[PDB]
């Protein structure tokens, strides 16, 4: 099958685009794999194959490591990424951004239902497992519990049947059947749980699916709009149905060839101790638990050699980086232009921490408007902060045609030389906040409102008359023939391969 | 003579050290010279040395570029400005900063004044040169003027004799005999002009010496304090006495091993045409020409075979960000801990295009002082923005004792997750702007007045009892043990040199 619908081809493919390395020794799940792979993350190394996790019995697990990191040169940047999508594995972050956004207008293609695949190999009844007993990883030495579910999809249903939504929300152990999990506001899990929790007649159907279609965990990473549900959007965005199986205990759907899947319910009623995590900002407060949702695990299937996708999250640079931010980019690229603002591009900046997005305006588009910095910064904040999407962004940089947003060091150069501090700038308090980061719930005011921004790195001329400087750079500061001069005596003159 | 004390000692360092490339074949001063100095700058090149420039006549001049800017390795990054110190090539800014700051608190060690030096070699009267007819650069395509100094150093004295000033302001060519350029409030050259202004009798008696004692250099571009002569600092730091000889027509001293001294005047009533310049932040505006000081040459006295030194300025990395930021950060770290602030270390983030300083604070003498974040920020943001070191600076960022400053990806990861936006911050609107910013001369609001701001990245236990999280990185969500046996196996298992 190819790598984008089917995880186990995934893990070739990176293989023989010699982007793993295979451990065949043992390694210990206990913080071991998610050093190796912290420290992969951190270097932009190949992924980490585990082949010989200490604890794996009965085919229960391998792990892959940083499924959705960066690689080291900068011509397959985001190759790892591009293997997620079909797409060449020199594909831009607009390509991909592109790819993702492309079956918004696209006719939904739905999954079709096979009656057995690959996922059904094994199981494990109520009887016969235990979830403490399986190889699961401490991922963080000071992590609340051990993270089995840092990269499936879970799978829940609206109570009328019309949205079946799969996402990624963290999930850890809590006992031999249960997990317990972030199911928090604004998150489609979220919303859905409310409907069956005002139905008040039963718990949530429940599956969590790992080792997924690449482009399907894509997708579920991703905020595509309220009630649409994901299988057809990554069946339009892949021109391809997805095929799925139905859940032996209960009536979801799971792609066929799943690594491993869970299936049970989620509570209405029930909590459980949850977290800390080391997280996508990179931080973990030790001794940080809450009550979180619990999950009850009546079944377990899965794949011979069945593999586990993990993401060892925290500091740069990570899948909470490069999917999370760049995803919510994406979408309030497209919510925008919805919205009749003339922006081109959007990218949240890995030197954000992915808390900034960068919105690349058409200069021209904005001039034929007549309008003021204080007048756009309002427009655009109130369609971004007030929508789902633009709930993990904190700042938005608005900067003009020259900036490519793609590339974090344009954008800060911008956002310091074009936006005065405070004038150019409308704070935004009455909004939703995202708790998760520092200065939201471990900082000074309400954890779960406000702390926005809209930073204009427009400048004057460009609501009016047009840009009216030139850069002090190579580029831009010396006539053509003259710069390809000095680069084609470059050499000759004694100074110093774009794969590499 | 060491290449601290003479410039054309530091040449022949930067060869020794295969940090030079000598052109010998012919270049242009109109715009080639400094094209290949940009490139230079923005790959962090080896500095060139300019032998053979179209237009040199009777030994004016040879140019060397690039003198303060980055080498690219990171073991050697800031060994050109180390050659400026008689500093290991290898020395931290930490380093660097304190050895800038060492005489701060010494006496100062008052010039020496000799008969004669190598300045002293070839001369022009004011019948015999014209400064039109110099290899003065065009350094970027829309520049006002041809900017004969980028690199030199101003002297003025003022007129009760009692302080004589170093410092690098830009001049360009205005005619044959007259220079233009920036004399600017909270300027030392502006204050001492503004004394001799009211006295009303006289011009200022000037001179400008280019490729002056590197020592000397690094100096004219710090903020020491008011009053302050900048050669008995220079002689401080150094621990000996600089060699001083007289100008021909006025009873100004320069150094003896100067490569070019410009003497004469700067006027008290006149004015001229000066810029537009590509400048530190970079950009430059192609027409925004303004009135600026004028300068009278009477005589010209030069080393046989001289050499200008150039800095090509603009967009990251050159002379303008190694010296400027790091040199008001390392007096703004100073002017703190004489105010009682417990700020151990400051720099200016490159990525912010020196206009950010970060302040590194010791959080144990913090949670003494029994204050809150409001409070602090107003205290920091009073002393600092209310002082000319804090001129060029405008975004203020507090970080407690785990983040180097020193590291750009450090301090915007702190200020990006540990900063909330609004309410961790305070502005500052009735302080002196840095008009050469693009969002104050070229912005909304007053050129010269606001756009300041404190952000502070202190998390709230910093304040109380202190740090209350670990990083989700590899060096701290994992013991040591395990970290070293993955390191240890790191190349076993099939992942990926210090000098490079
Ligand atoms: C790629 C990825 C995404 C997420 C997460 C992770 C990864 C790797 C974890 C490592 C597991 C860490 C965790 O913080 N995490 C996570 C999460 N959203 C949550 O509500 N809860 C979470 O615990 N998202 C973000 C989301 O997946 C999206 O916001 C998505 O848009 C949700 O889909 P939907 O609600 O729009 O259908
Ligand atoms: C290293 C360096 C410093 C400066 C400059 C340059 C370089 C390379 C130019 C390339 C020439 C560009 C120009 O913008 N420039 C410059 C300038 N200060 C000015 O008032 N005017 C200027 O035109 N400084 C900054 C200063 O030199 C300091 O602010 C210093 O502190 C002044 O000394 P003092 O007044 O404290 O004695
Ligand atoms: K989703
Ligand atoms: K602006
Ligand atoms: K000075
Ligand atoms: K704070
Ligand atoms: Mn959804
Ligand atoms: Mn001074």
């Given at each position: 099958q190819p790598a984008h619908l089917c995880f186990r081809s995934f893990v070739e493919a990176l293989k023989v685009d010699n982007d793993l390395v295979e451990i065949n020794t043992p390694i210990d799940p206990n913080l071991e794999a998610a050093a190796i792979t912290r420290r992969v993350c951190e270097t932009n190394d190949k992924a980490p194959l585990?082949?010989?996790?200490?604890?794996?019995?009965?085919?229960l697990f391998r792990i892959l490591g940083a499924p959705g990191s960066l690689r080291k040169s900068s011509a397959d940047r985001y190759g790892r990424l591009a293997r997620h999508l079909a797409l060449?594995?020199?594909?831009?972050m607009r390509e991909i951004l592109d790819k993702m956004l492309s079956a918004s207008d696209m006719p939904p293609i739905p999954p079709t239902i096979v009656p057995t695949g690959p996922c059904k190999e094994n199981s494990l009844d109520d009887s016969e497992f235990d979830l403490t007993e399986l190889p699961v990883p401490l991922i963080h030495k000071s992590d609340g519990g051990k993270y089995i579910q840092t990269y499936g999809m879970h799978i829940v249903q609206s109570p009328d049947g019309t949205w079946t939504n799969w996402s990624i929300a963290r999930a850890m152990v809590h006992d031999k059947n249960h997990l317990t999990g972030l199911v928090i506001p604004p998150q489609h899990i979220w919303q859905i749980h409310q409907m069956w929790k005002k139905e008040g007649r039963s718990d949530v159907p429940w599956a969590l699916a790992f080792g997924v279609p690449p482009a399907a965990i894509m997708a579920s990473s991703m905020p595509i709009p309220?009630?649409?549900?994901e299988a057809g959007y990554v069946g339009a965005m892949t021109g391809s149905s997805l095929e799925l199986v139905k859940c032996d205990t209960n009536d979801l759907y799971v792609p066929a060839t799943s690594e491993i899947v869970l299936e049970g319910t989620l509570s209405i009623s029930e909590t459980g101790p949850e977290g800390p995590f080391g997280q996508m900002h990179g931080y973990i407060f030790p001794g940080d638990t809450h009550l979180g949702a619990k999950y009850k695990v009546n079944r377990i299937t899965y794949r011979n050699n069945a593999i586990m996708p993990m993401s060892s999250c925290g500091?740069?640079?990570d899948e909470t980086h490069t999917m999370i931010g760049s995803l919510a980019a994406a979408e309030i690229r497209k919510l925008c232009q919805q919205n009749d603002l003339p922006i081109t591009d959007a990218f949240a900046p890995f030197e954000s921490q992915v808390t900034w997005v960068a919105l690349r305006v058409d200069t021209e588009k904005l001039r034929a408007m007549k309008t003021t910095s204080e007048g756009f910064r309002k427009r655009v904040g109130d369609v971004v902060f007030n929508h789902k999407a633009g709930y993990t962004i904190h700042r938005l940089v608005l900067v003009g045609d020259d900036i490519d947003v793609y590339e974090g060091k344009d954008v800060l150069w911008a956002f310091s030389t074009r936006c005065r501090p405070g004038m150019d700038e409308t704070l935004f308090e009455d909004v939703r906040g995202f708790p998760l980061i520092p200065y939201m719930?471990?900082?000074?005011?309400?954890?779960?409102r406000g702390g926005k921004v809209v930073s204009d790195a427009?400048?004057?001329?460009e609501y009016t008359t047009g840009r009216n400087w030139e850069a002090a750079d190579f580029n831009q500061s010396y006539p053509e023939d003259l710069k390809q001069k000095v680069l084609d005596n470059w050499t000759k003159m004694g100074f110093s391969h774009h794969h590499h």
């Open positions: 585990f082949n010989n996790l200490i604890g794996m019995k009965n085919g060449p594995p020199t594909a831009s309220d009630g649409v549900t500091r740069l640079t719930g471990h900082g000074n005011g309400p954890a779960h427009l400048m004057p001329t």
